[PDB]
Structure formats: structure tokens, C-alpha cells
Write a protein that binds this ligand. Sequence first.
Ligand SMILES: *CCCn1cc(CN(C)C(=O)c2cc(C3=C(c4cc(C(=O)N(C)Cc5cn(CC*)nn5)sc4C)CCC3)c(C)s2)nn1
Lengths: 92, 12
Amino acid sequence: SQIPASEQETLVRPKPLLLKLLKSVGAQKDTYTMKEVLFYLGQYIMTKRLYDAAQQHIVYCSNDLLGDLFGVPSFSVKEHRKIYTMIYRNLV
Amino acid sequence: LTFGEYWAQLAS
Ligand SMILES: *CCCn1cc(CN(C)C(=O)c2cc(C3=C(c4cc(C(=O)N(C)Cc5cn(CC*)nn5)sc4C)CCC3)c(C)s2)nn1
């Protein structure tokens, strides 16, 4: 799946728990573009080494706060719409 | 690809 360009610019307010994750990788504000949320989420996945070393599009979050936020043990980075939905489910 | 390359496709 793929996201139209205009949706990447959508201004969102992450819930406290998602904000905590983002803050851990440097984010200091309360309102972000979806693009910005995705940047910090990427940084968080990289720092915590949650992606598979062989197929680097698979992310393992079963034993992490990311997994509790997304309600999935794993996901593929290729599922753009599923990822956007998981972020929209954690706004305020 | 590297995780970064896949992730960059998702952000843009
Ligand atoms: C994903 C593979 C790892 N990777 C490759 C690059 C190369 N790049 C874009 C650069 O020229 C520099 C990176 C840094 C640093 C950071 C940084 C990361 C950026 C990026 O675009 N990433 C990780 C992909 C992405 C895009 N989005 C938007 C939705 N989210 N994630 S751009 C950038 C600046 C962060 C630490 C250092 C440079 C300094 S030059 N970067 N990472």
C-alpha cells in the first residue's frame, strides 16, 4: 500500500504514550506532521534495533512499548497504510 | 534494502 503526498503533511497530536516514544529519540513538541512522527518512529526502530537483520523491512515489536502501541507483534515497513492506521489509532 | 531505505519510502 501507498499514501498520497498530501496525507504526509497532516498535523497530528500523538497520545502521551506515543509522545513518550517520540521523546526518547529527541522529539520535544506535542504536534507534528505525519512525516515528522514517521521520522522519529524510524529513529526509534533503528536505535532499539527492532528490525530484522536479514530482511530489513520486517520490524519486531512483541516485547517493546511500540508493540503495545501498535497492538501487533511485528509488521512490515512495506505496509504503508497499516502503519499510518496504527499511528492514527494513537492520536489525541 | 537497508531499513532506512524502506523507511524513507514510507515517510515520502
Ligand atoms: C534508512 C537508512 C539509514 N539512513 C540513511 C541516511 C542518509 N541520509 C538521508 C543522509 O544524508 C543523512 C542522515 C543523517 C542523519 C539523520 C537523518 C535520517 C534521515 C532519513 O531520511 N531517514 C532515516 C529515513 C526517513 C525519512 N523519513 C521521513 C518520513 N523518516 N525516516 S534524513 C537525516 C538528516 C538522523 C541522524 C543523522 C545525516 C546527518 S546526513 N540516513 N539514515
